[PDB]
Amino acid sequence: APQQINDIVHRTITPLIEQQKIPGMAVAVIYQGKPYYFTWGYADIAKKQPVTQQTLFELGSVSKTFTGVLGGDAIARGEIKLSDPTTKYWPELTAKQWNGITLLHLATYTAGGLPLQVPDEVKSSSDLLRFYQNWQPAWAPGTQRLYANSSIGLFGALAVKPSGLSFEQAMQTRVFQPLKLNHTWINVPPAEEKNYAWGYREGKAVHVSPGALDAEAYGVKSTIEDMARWVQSNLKPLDINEKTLQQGIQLAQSRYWQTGDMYQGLGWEMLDWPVNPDSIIPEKAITPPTPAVRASWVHKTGATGGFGSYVAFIPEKELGIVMLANKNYPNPARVDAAWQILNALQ
């Protein structure tokens, strides 16, 4: 790798690993449209199995970028419109509080205080319907953002419906396959388990628990190579041959909502570039949404019990980074490390 990349990556990530006691990490830097890979530590501590470029990590909430782009690919196809009411895709949602709640609201976390997590007791499809039917907004829809899995989880599940495909299959056939993300999974196959890192919560080896709407919100697993490829695809959508997927990516980076200095996209979140880490670490809709601004810090954090992940990229600079850890360390530390690297190479 270019020495200048080697230099900052090693000086930045290595101590980050020791401070946070991360068992294993993989990093990718996208520099002038090429990826460079870095690996440290262990995917499985007990078996002394090292992290490689083949290692699967849980992406957690970074999954939502796939979801957003898939939702975006659906808008481009004409299958859905953000303005569509929720009840158009789930007529069974008859309770009056859903009157006027739209896909936009769901996608942007502005439905009115949908909760952080779908409650644990929700297991069946009828549990899920009962949960949303009995939920009462904490404030008016369309007025105030509260980040929520039960919000973007629902959006992704609804956005696939016109297509007739399950969310898992829309995701695989419209997003994963056309971008050759051949080692990116919602469900890891038996033969890939040897590549699936263990996550580490309080010293014990864990893996993400099944939960309702887990696929849509936090359940993707991927390798550093595929995630680098995911960043290349979002950095340069124009290289993508499939037109709806090209527009889908672009729409995901539109700005639909501003809160403080942050802009809500579909999955992706954004800040005007340049910004300093402190600001990465006034509340209103943007109508119509601002088309994607190339001078942006486009990013997303992700966590599960045993994993911490981060992706960020600046389109203007054709620059990006992916950091995948099998331990869930604090988000500020991720944004500090990444900004240091991208800023050094800017």
Side-chain angles (χ1 to χ4, degrees):
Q3 311 161 335
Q4 59 281 30
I5 299 171
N6 225 85
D7 177 46
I8 197 69
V9 167
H10 278 108
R11 284 190 298 109
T12 309
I13 303 298
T14 309
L16 162 65
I17 293 180
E18 187 70 23
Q19 193 186 233
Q20 301 291 167
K21 292 185 181 180
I22 286 162
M25 197 154 196
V27 169
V29 173
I30 295 68
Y31 184 81
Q32 281 161 207
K34 276 215 71 234
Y36 303 92
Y37 305 108
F38 302 89
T39 62
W40 299 257
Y42 293 119
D44 184 332
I45 299 174
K47 289 173 209 64
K48 284 161 123 41
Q49 171 60 42
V51 176
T52 72
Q53 285 165 230
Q54 294 317 163
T55 306
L56 293 160
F57 289 78
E58 302 179 355
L59 305 188
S61 276
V62 173
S63 303
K64 301 176 193 176
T65 57
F66 298 96
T67 294
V69 166
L70 179 67
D73 157 297
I75 305 174
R77 285 172 191 264
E79 280 166 359
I80 64 152
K81 300 174 85 176
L82 291 175
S83 61
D84 296 333
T86 299
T87 57
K88 178 154 156 142
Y89 305 103
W90 202 356
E92 286 72 14
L93 213 46
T94 69
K96 70 172 171 264
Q97 71 267 29
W98 294 86
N99 294 165
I101 300 187
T102 56
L103 292 193
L104 188 53
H105 300 151
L106 291 184
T108 55
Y109 315 108
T110 53
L114 276 169
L116 176 58
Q117 295 303 155
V118 182
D120 252 324
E121 43 279 19
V122 174
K123 311 275 181 154
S124 55
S125 49
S126 86
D127 277 340
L128 222 232
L129 172 78
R130 176 189 139 102
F131 157 70
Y132 288 106
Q133 290 273 71
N134 293 149
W135 159 85
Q136 286 301 148
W139 57 83
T143 70
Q144 185 198 323
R145 182 204 185 268
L146 179 73
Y147 150 66
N149 287 325
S150 58
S151 190
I152 196 162
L154 186 53
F155 164 76
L158 293 190
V160 299
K161 301 237 185 238
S163 82
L165 307 168
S166 84
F167 180 89
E168 285 91 339
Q169 286 311 291
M171 186 59 78
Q172 189 73 55
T173 61
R174 297 180 161 182
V175 191
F176 296 167
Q177 265 140 222
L179 306 164
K180 300 165 143 74
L181 309 183
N182 301 320
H183 283 88
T184 290
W185 315 98
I186 314 247
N187 313 308
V188 176
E192 300 286 350
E193 264 148 34
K194 71 182 179 289
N195 287 332
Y196 191 0
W198 281 101
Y200 291 89
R201 188 200 255 260
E202 239 108 69
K204 284 178 181 180
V206 282
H207 270 159
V208 62
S209 272
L213 296 175
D214 66 1
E216 287 86 355
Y218 58 81
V220 180
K221 297 83 184 180
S222 206
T223 63
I224 200 73
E225 295 187 23
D226 277 27
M227 293 303 293
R229 199 160 174 96
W230 180 235
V231 178
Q232 292 174 293
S233 318
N234 281 263
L235 266 174
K236 241 185 169 272
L238 294 177
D239 279 5
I240 299 151
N241 315 136
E242 295 71 13
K243 198 80 177 292
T244 60
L245 185 58
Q246 181 218 104
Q247 304 162 263
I249 299 205
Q250 309 171 300
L251 298 184
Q253 276 165 60
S254 289
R255 292 159 177 212
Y256 301 78
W257 187 277
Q258 166 171 54
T259 150
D261 283 317
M262 89 104 98
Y263 299 96
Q264 189 55 58
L266 314 166
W268 292 116
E269 295 157 26
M270 294 97 43
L271 297 93
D272 281 302
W273 175 264
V275 247
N276 284 51
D278 291 47
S279 6
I280 295 165
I281 300 173
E283 159 132 47
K284 92 285 255 300
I286 299 151
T287 182
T290 308
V293 175
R294 280 181 54 80
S296 294
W297 177 271
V298 183
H299 77 152
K300 188 80 201 59
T301 52
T304 58
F307 291 78
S309 59
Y310 191 65
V311 170
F313 64 86
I314 311 173
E316 188 183 42
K317 301 290 163 210
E318 305 303 337
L319 199 65
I321 188 171
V322 179
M323 302 153 60
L324 308 181
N326 64 353
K327 165 153 183 182
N328 168 36
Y329 62 108
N331 291 344
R334 299 169 203 202
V335 169
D336 283 328
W339 190 92
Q340 252 220 348
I341 291 150
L342 300 192
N343 173 71
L345 299 166
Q346 157 198 27

